[PDB]
Amino acid sequence: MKCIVGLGNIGKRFELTRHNIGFEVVDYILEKNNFSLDKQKFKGAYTIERMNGDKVLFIEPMTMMNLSGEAVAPIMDYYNVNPEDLIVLYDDLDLEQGQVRLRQKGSAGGHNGMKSIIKMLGTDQFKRIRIGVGRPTNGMTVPDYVLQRFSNDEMVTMEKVIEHAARAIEKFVETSRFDHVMNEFNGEVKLEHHHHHH
């Protein structure tokens, strides 16, 4: 059983904020397959659903971002999930909008949700998809930038990114070949260009 975790903050005022890009990808996968986070446990919203004939566990922590691991770790323990079978979706400041990086393991790169998970699991040996959200270029602090809503201009690219990352998850659940998923999905989505842009 794979465990797909979307990182983010609960509440209507955090909807579509840059720091909730993980939630948005999981929300898209759930709506596309007509699933919902119908259970709750250890402050984590989750569901267990069959998808291509395979049971998959989805989790959105209801802790806040900085405390994400205190839902994820015990829900994984309860359902005996190895870190091998975990994939975490989250926002990356050091990638540009349009970019995604899929990795087998490694550091949080200073992202507080990933740090809470590493601390609670006691390892960084789990899969992740870093989703580019860009840096602030106009003197916003990082906290204010990640807790701000995506503009409609940003969403022209980010809608497609969400679709691209959902497909990466969907392909990983079907095949269980992560390296093959990395090769197909690492990169950028095709940017939307009109004739008049040239």
Q: Residues in the chain, how many?
A: 198
Annotated binding site, which residues?
14, 64, 66, 112
Query: What gap in Å lies between CA 193 and CA 72, rounded to an integer?
Result: 39
DSSP 192: -
Q: In the block, which residue shows the tokens 């490694």?
A: 106
The SS3 assignment for 172 reads helix
Which has the closest alpha carbon to 104: 1, 181, 6?
A: 181
For residue 19, indicate whether it is catalytic.
yes
The SS3 assignment for 159 reads helix
- In single-letter form, the type of residue at position 198 comes to H
Distances (CA, A) of 129 to 10, 185, 186: 20, 10, 9
Structure token digits, residue 77: 């323990």
Asked whether 158 and 164 are in contact (CB, 8 A), the reply is no
Neighbours of 112 (CB within 10 A): 18
The SS3 assignment for 153 reads helix
Domain boundaries, the chain: 1-198
Distances (CA, A) of 135 to 41, 119, 126, 157, 195: 34, 26, 25, 15, 28
Annotated binding site for tRNA, which residues?
14, 64, 66, 112
Asked whether 30 and 47 are in contact (CB, 8 A), the reply is yes
This structure's resolution (Å) is 2.2
- Distance, C-alpha 168 to centroid of its chain: 11
Asked whether 22 and 131 are in contact (CB, 8 A), the reply is yes
Strand order in the sheet with 2-6: 39-41, 44-50, 55-61, 2-6, 86-92, 127-132, 99-103, 187-188
Of 19, 193, 195, 196, the active-site residue reads 19
Identify the bridge partners of residue 17 per DSSP, sorted by sequence position.
149
Q: In the block, which residue shows the tokens 């984590």?
A: 44
Non-local (6+) Cβ contacts of 81 within 8 A are 1, 3, 57
Which has the closest alpha carbon to 2: 104, 107, 127, 121?
A: 127
Say yes or no: domain 1-198 is CATH 3.40.50.1470.
yes
Asked whether 100 and 164 are in contact (CB, 8 A), the reply is yes
DSSP string, 38-85: -EEETTEEEEEEESSS-EEEEEEESS-GGGTHHHHHHHHHHTT--GGG
Structural biology method used:
X-ray
